[PDB]
Amino acid sequence: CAETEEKYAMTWSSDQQHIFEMPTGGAAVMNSGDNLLYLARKEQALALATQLRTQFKIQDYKIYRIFPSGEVQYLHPKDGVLPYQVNKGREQVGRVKSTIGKNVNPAQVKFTSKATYDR
Amino acid sequence: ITDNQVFVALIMALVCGYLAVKLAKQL
Amino acid sequence: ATKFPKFSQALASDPTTRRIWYGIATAHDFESHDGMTEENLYQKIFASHFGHLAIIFLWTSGNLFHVAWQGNFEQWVANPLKTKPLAHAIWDPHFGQAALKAFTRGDTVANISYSGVYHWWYTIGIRNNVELYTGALGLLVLSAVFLLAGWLHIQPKFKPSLSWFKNNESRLNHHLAGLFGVSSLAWTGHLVHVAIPASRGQHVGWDNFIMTPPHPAGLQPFFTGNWSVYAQSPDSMQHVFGTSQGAGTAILTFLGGFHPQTQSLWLTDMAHHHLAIAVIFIVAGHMYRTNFGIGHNLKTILEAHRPPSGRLGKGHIGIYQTLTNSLHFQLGLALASLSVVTSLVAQHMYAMPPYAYMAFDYVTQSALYTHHQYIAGLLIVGAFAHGAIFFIRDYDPEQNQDNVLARMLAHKEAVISHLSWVSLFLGFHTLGLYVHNDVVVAFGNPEKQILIEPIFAQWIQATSGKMLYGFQVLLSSSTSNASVAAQQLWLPGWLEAVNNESNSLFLTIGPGDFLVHHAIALGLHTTTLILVKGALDARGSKLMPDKKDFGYSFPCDGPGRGGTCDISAWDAFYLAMFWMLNTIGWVTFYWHWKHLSLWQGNVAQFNESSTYLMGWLRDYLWLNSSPLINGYNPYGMNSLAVWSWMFLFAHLVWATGFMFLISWRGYWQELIETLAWAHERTPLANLIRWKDKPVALSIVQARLVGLVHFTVGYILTYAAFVIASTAGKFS
Amino acid sequence: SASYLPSILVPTVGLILPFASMAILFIAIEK
Amino acid sequence: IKKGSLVKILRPESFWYNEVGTVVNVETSKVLYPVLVRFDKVNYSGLNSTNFSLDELVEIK
Amino acid sequence: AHTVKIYDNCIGCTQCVRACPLDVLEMVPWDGCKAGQMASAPRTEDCVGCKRCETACPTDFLSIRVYLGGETTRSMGLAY
Amino acid sequence: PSMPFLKRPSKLDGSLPGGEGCFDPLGFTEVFSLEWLREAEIKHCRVAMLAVLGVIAQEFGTFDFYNAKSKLQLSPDLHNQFVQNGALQQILLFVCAWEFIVGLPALIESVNGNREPGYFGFDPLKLGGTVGSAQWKRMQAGELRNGRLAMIAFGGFFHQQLLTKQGIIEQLAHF
Ligand code: CLA
Ligand code: CLA
Ligand code: CLA
Ligand code: CLA
Ligand code: CLA
Numbered sequence A: 001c002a003e004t005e006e007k008y009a010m011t012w013s014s015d016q017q018h019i020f021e022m023p024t025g026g027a028a029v030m031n032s033g034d035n036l037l038y039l040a041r042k043e044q045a046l047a048l049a050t051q052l053r054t055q056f057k058i059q060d061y062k063i064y065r066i067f068p069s070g071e072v073q074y075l076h077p078k079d080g081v082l083p084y085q086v087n088k089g090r091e092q093v094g095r096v097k098s099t100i101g102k103n104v105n106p107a108q109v110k111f112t113s114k115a116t117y118d119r
Numbered sequence B: 001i002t003d004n005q006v007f008v009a010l011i012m013a014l015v016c017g018y019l020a021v022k023l024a025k026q027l
Numbered sequence C: 001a002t003k004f005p006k007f008s009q010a011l012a013s014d015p016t017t018r019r020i021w022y023g024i025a026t027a028h029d030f031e032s033h034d035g036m037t038e039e040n041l042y043q044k045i046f047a048s049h050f051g052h053l054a055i056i057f058l059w060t061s062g063n064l065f066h067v068a069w070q071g072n073f074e075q076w077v078a079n080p081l082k083t084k085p086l087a088h089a090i091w092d093p094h095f096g097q098a099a100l101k102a103f104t105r106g107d108t109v110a111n112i113s114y115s116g117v118y119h120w121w122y123t124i125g126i127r128n129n130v131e132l133y134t135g136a137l138g139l140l141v142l143s144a145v146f147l148l149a150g151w152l153h154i155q156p157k158f159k160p161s162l163s164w165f166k167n168n169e170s171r172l173n174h175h176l177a178g179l180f181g182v183s184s185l186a187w188t189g190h191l192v193h194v195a196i197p198a199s200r201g202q203h204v205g206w207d208n209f210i211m212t213p214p215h216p217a218g219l220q221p222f223f224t225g226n227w228s229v230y231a232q233s234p235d236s237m238q239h240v241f242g243t244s245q246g247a248g249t250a251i252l253t254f255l256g257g258f259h260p261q262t263q264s265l266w267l268t269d270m271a272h273h274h275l276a277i278a279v280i281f282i283v284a285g286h287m288y289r290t291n292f293g294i295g296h297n298l299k300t301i302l303e304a305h306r307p308p309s310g311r312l313g314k315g316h317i318g319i320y321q322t323l324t325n326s327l328h329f330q331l332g333l334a335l336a337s338l339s340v341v342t343s344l345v346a347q348h349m350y351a352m353p354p355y356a357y358m359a360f361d362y363v364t365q366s367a368l369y370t371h372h373q374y375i376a377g378l379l380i381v382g383a384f385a386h387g388a389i390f391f392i393r394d395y396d397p398e399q400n401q402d403n404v405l406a407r408m409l410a411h412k413e414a415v416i417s418h419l420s421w422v423s424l425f426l427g428f429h430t431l432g433l434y435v436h437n438d439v440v441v442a443f444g445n446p447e448k449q450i451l452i453e454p455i456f457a458q459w460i461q462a463t464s465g466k467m468l469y470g471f472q473v474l475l476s477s478s479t480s481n482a483s484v485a486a487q488q489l490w491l492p493g494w495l496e497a498v499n500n501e502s503n504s505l506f507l508t509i510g511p512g513d514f515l516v517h518h519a520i521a522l523g524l525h526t527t528t529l530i531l532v533k534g535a536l537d538a539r540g541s542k543l544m545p546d547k548k549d550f551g552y553s554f555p556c557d558g559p560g561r562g563g564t565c566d567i568s569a570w571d572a573f574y575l576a577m578f579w580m581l582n583t584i585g586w587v588t589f590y591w592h593w594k595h596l597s598l599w600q601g602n603v604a605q606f607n608e609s610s611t612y613l614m615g616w617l618r619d620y621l622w623l624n625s626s627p628l629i630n631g632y633n634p635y636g637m638n639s640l641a642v643w644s645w646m647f648l649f650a651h652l653v654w655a656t657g658f659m660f661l662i663s664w665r666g667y668w669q670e671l672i673e674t675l676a677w678a679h680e681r682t683p684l685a686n687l688i689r690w691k692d693k694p695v696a697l698s699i700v701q702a703r704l705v706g707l708v709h710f711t712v713g714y715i716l717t718y719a720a721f722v723i724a725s726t727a728g729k730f731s
Numbered sequence D: 001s002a003s004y005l006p007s008i009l010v011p012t013v014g015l016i017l018p019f020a021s022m023a024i025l026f027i028a029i030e031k
Numbered sequence E: 001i002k003k004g005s006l007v008k009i010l011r012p013e014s015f016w017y018n019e020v021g022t023v024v025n026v027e028t029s030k031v032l033y034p035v036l037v038r039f040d041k042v043n044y045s046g047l048n049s050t051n052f053s054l055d056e057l058v059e060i061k
Numbered sequence F: 001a002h003t004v005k006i007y008d009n010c011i012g013c014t015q016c017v018r019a020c021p022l023d024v025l026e027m028v029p030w031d032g033c034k035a036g037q038m039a040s041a042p043r044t045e046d047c048v049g050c051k052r053c054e055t056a057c058p059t060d061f062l063s064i065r066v067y068l069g070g071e072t073t074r075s076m077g078l079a080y
Numbered sequence G: 001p002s003m004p005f006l007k008r009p010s011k012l013d014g015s016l017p018g019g020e021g022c023f024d025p026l027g028f029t030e031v032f033s034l035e036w037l038r039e040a041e042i043k044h045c046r047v048a049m050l051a052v053l054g055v056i057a058q059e060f061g062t063f064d065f066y067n068a069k070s071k072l073q074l075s076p077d078l079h080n081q082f083v084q085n086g087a088l089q090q091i092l093l094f095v096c097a098w099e100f101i102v103g104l105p106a107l108i109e110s111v112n113g114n115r116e117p118g119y120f121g122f123d124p125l126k127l128g129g130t131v132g133s134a135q136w137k138r139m140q141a142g143e144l145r146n147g148r149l150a151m152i153a154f155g156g157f158f159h160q161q162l163l164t165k166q167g168i169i170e171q172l173a174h175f
């Protein structure tokens, strides 16, 4: 709940009072000017981002991750840029030198606290 | 067929129970 | 270490209920903990071995104590045909009044011990309850010894070094000599000193076993090699087991065959038997080098067996490295060899019944066989399951550079294609012939059946003297080389047991033997198609070659690339456990319906009504469950009312398995959200909030728990039907 | 034959041992 | 190396390991996997056209 | 957390990022491909591990591999 | 060498109570850590002194009420006159207390190396129970040597059976 779990607060703006669909279920009123939406988990929120963005222009939208100590975060957008569009600011993490074909066998990782792909 | 040997039995497996908890609280 | 999985911090951070289940099911997975290296692994499995052994000897002291204290053991010794062997007594507060009249056997209300234990303790020479108490204390002491060692070798300076554990070289010098050779020799020191005289009437307890020699002259004029004196006067014919009438005094006579009266093997034959096995194992203990240096280096024994024919890769060079460093290879060979040993035990406990007045109670013999067959299949499936664990988490194809193992992974495609071929062939040629015989029998015509005589088994019984077929070969022909070659030694005492149709040795054979034994080979080849599949495709398939990276029991790969339900090496276990229960199913349905035709007497009831499937579902399941399912009526109950309850109970286990096997997680993972919504929202219970978050069971656990209910439901149903069926047609 | 001993041990291990052992194991989750 | 050449692969994790295929694209622009090759038969993703490097690229005649 | 690692088959066709419903994966300008793009997974703390990326990863065999690691609150995806 | 023997100068021992020397010809103290073997030596020597005084003191002819001995070996008459009384079971069982209760953690004190591995306390003596330097070592050598001669001398007290079948007093009445 709001006493111990992270509530995700999707904030966005529109132009017309349309009708979208909640990830809770059922239609919502969709305040035209600017509106927030407290949600439970992130897949609901970005599923609402796909719910709106694949319909029509809904941009300048992002969830503030309400965590129960009080402060916020900035999910989705992160960098005023759409994530599959390429911005030259995102520093890559999570790559290796080659394919799976050069991953070590787990009998070399055995009795060590490594992973089968680290090289 | 008697009763005293049953008491001796539960004494020996009570001690064996102390070795069971004794081995159990080290691994 | 912080919470629960005091061993894995990858699960102590989990807030769900998965920390409990995976905290349990990865507890013994010692190869994947926080920081447990090799010395900290062998020094834990070595202690837990001792804890295990002490659990075994606590259990056998349990049987010794309940038979010592609640059983009717010496009253059973008085009349081993008549009185039923009693198990431990009952304390139910639920047996109201009418149940207790269905269990009173004397003052006791005990269960009837359908586990063959009084027979083996009666051939050991236990003829009292006092020896059972001294033995039960004698194993409480031994379990305290083993718990002392496991506690003692986890004390820090007595934790043995890993170079001692890698004395792989010399365990075989000590197991084959000390564990196998000496103890079996020591077991002759029982059988010569206890079972022979207490079978020949002489109560040699713990007093006179040094003053009464088992032969009237012994060991001062017997280092001279006059060993035919120890096989001088056998127990010939006119003897009842236990008294001294009609019995000789020789010790190691190898007559061969059975008693005439108790239909069990001679204890002279077992004394000579374990003596010869003892000598041959002690000879086999002198096999390998040690600190002395007279033996065989194992590197020189696997390195030398590279054929110059060149077909078998670069030989076994690489195998000795991957047994020392491995464990699941060594455990795979251990469960393979123990499992074939169990199936050998099962195939000889009925065939050559060792224990006096077995094959006279027709329930304990029917439970020991089925017991060791289901344990046999469990340990084979363990050998292949740890085979796949060896090929994932333990296999190095750079130390196994083009080795015999890497050759196996090379031609694993041909292996799985040909296992699938023979399994397909037998599955269209058992099911084809049973549906042929069942259609044809169904159409008013049992004659137009396909019955193939299994001539190869009939010819092999002709090689062992069964003259009821008319082949007249090596032992059935009384004039051949082997027939003259042991004419005095062990043949005429043994061909009487072969040509007899009372005993369960070399049974008479119809085409039910043919069609069933093809069904069994179907079970073995399907089950090895699965196990050898997900043991050789355990590491990488053309669906996903990442499989070695994910460990053994990873769930899936998602819907990607067509869908990937059960790709892991754990699936081969998960499916060949169904085929294990099925195959051991057909083994024990076949054995049990063969012997419900022998023990009833109507062998024609089998051989006329087993070549088709309504012979099984009619003449065996529908008819022999009649004294089962009458276990309690609206007219009353009887002593079978436990088993007829358990039977029904076990169906409720079995089908609950289907709830986990058929219907998978994401149903329940979005149903627990309704339950947690309803618990959070309600008054008077939102105070009582969970700590571990309620989460449906993960899809490795779920398939596992559905498998566990499938096994428990299966095995409890069939343990209900063996015992209630034979105990309903008899006793 | 101390016939009274199952009337002691079968309840004190049958029911009250999987009460206090539930307490020992379940508090032992949080110790 | 060249376009249209029938090429067997030597990387053990492809679906088309030890199966010949036709080269569609060869790129000369420092790409680590420049050679886009498609095939007759099709893997599980419904996708014959993949790409490879030069070491895993054996032509025939 | 579910460790998502993105190998060098990643030709940057962005069906991973457009397929992931969690924005754990972005695109990074990487001058090693024809498109100059290669995906990255910085925010794997939010990674469910539903492997909807590996469905829509049109490489030879799976530039992006999702190894099932730890299970936190968010990675378990429970609503409450 | 340090040994008064052929040759092995101080393999691992040399300060132990060998007043005539450190014997150790065979490679046990090479690899057995020597504290284990010292606890085993002292425990065997105590129980063997009890054994030999048992055999001699029983061969001075004393019974509450039993059979004639004719031997203090050969299990049925002696030993399984005693076992069938239900009598040796407790005289084993109290030692089954003693070793597991006060010998096993005592042996844990023979694990760490903080014991001088004899030493179950136990000096109920005045004017001669020196725990210090002189009489502790030269009397511990007395327990050691009389225990070793108890080990072998109990060996002969067992093995005078084949040409004898009689008591050892009757062996003294024979040559
Ligand atoms: C002579 C010396 C000796 C002896 C007796 C043993 C004995 C044992 N060692 Mg061992 N060991 C030794 C020397 C010895 N070791 C040395 C020198 C080393 C160092 C190189 C080791 C290193 C070592 C390790 C590392 C381990 C052992 C283990 C074991 C135990 C095996 C488990 C068991 O009980 O199986 C008993 C098996 C049988 C009795 C036979 C099973 C198979 C037969 C063919 C079937 C049974 C026969 C018959 C048909 C059935 C009778 C049943 C009856 C109802 C009819 C066993 C107690 C293991 C253990 O559990 O730790 C305690 C273990 O992990 N040992
Ligand atoms: C002496 C034999 C032996 C030994 C040492 C091992 C040892 C091991 N096995 Mg194993 N295994 C064996 C035999 C053995 N196996 C056999 C015979 C089989 C075939 C049945 C298997 C099948 C098997 C599988 C499939 C897997 C292992 C795994 C493992 C490893 C971890 C086990 C663990 O943490 O479990 C923790 C302990 C438990 C889960 C408790 C067991 C409870 C089971 C699941 C159900 C029993 C409940 C019971 C029936 C309910 C009672 C109710 C009543 C009505 C009946 C460990 C090295 C695992 C592994 O290495 O993968 C990482 C793994 O996935 N084994
Ligand atoms: C009644 C239950 C049943 C049956 C018949 C089978 C049969 C088979 N399983 Mg199996 N299996 C079952 C339950 C069953 N399974 C369960 C519960 C599990 C656990 C999930 C498994 C797990 C399992 C695994 C893991 C594997 C098998 C495999 C096989 C095949 C083994 C090879 C063989 O015998 O081929 C002979 C073929 C048959 C016996 C098929 C029956 C013949 C049919 C009925 C005739 C053809 C159709 C007929 C003309 C009717 C027309 C229909 C009409 C609409 C026109 C065989 C098809 C293996 C395999 O693929 O082997 C190659 C394999 O690896 N099974
Ligand atoms: C490949 C499938 C297969 C498998 C696994 C088995 C397995 C078995 N059969 Mg067998 N059997 C098979 C096919 C098979 N059979 C066929 C096709 C026939 C002819 C109908 C028989 C006839 C047969 C008899 C008569 C007996 C057995 C028996 C047995 C059991 C003992 C082993 C033995 O005698 O080997 C037998 C091994 C073979 C016959 C070789 C089979 C391998 C080839 C590839 C099968 C195909 C051959 C092909 C159809 C012939 C070509 C035409 C040719 C006539 C010109 C064992 C379960 C015995 C039994 O039940 O005792 C328990 C027994 O008495 N079998
Ligand atoms: C994956 C399944 C799973 C698992 C392993 C657990 C495990 C746990 N839950 Mg849990 N839970 C689950 C699903 C699960 N839950 C679901 C789906 C819900 C609904 C949202 C809950 C709701 C829930 C609450 C509300 C609470 C727990 C709590 C707990 C913890 C204490 C055990 C307990 O209360 O149950 C024990 C079993 C029962 C209470 C069964 C109730 C019905 C019985 C049969 C009636 C009693 C009859 C009789 C008198 C019993 C006497 C014998 C007995 C004393 C031995 C334990 C860690 C408690 C906790 O975290 O406190 C620290 C707690 O307060 N759970």
Ligand code: CLA
Binding pocket: C093, C094, D010, D011, D014, D015, D016
């Ligand atoms: C494994 C151990 C075990 C034991 C020893 C018992 C014992 C008992 N059960 Mg029981 N039960 C068990 C498991 C067990 N159950 C399980 C697993 C289930 C679920 C299937 C049940 C379900 C069950 C039901 C549904 C009922 C019983 C009842 C009873 C009582 C029988 C009534 C009778 O004729 O006695 C004569 C009765 C008495 C002498 C009065 C005794 C009343 C209590 C038990 C004693 C006082 C308790 C005290 C205040 C608190 C002390 C601690 C306490 C936990 C013992 C008896 C005490 C019946 C019952 O409720 O009886 C009270 C009943 O209706 N049981």
Ligand SMILES: CC1=C(/C=C/C(C)=C/C=C/C(C)=C/C=C/C=C(C)/C=C/C=C(C)/C=C/C2=C(C)CCCC2(C)C)C(C)(C)CCC1
Binding pocket: C329, C332, C333, C336, C340, C380, C383, C384, C386, C387, C388, C390, C535
């Ligand atoms: C996966 C794996 C594995 C597996 C496991 C197992 C399970 C195996 C199998 C195996 C088995 C399970 C076994 C079996 C064997 C076989 C046999 C052994 C057969 C043969 C037979 C015979 C030999 C017989 C004959 C005869 C007769 C009849 C009489 C006369 C004489 C004679 C003896 C010749 C291993 C560990 C290895 C490796 C790793 C991986």
Ligand code: SF4
Binding pocket: F002, F004, F019, F020, F021, F022, F024, F025, F047, F048, F049, F050, F051, F052, F053, F054, F066
């Ligand atoms: S892991 Fe599951 S969530 Fe994270 S990217 Fe791949 S698919 Fe989307």
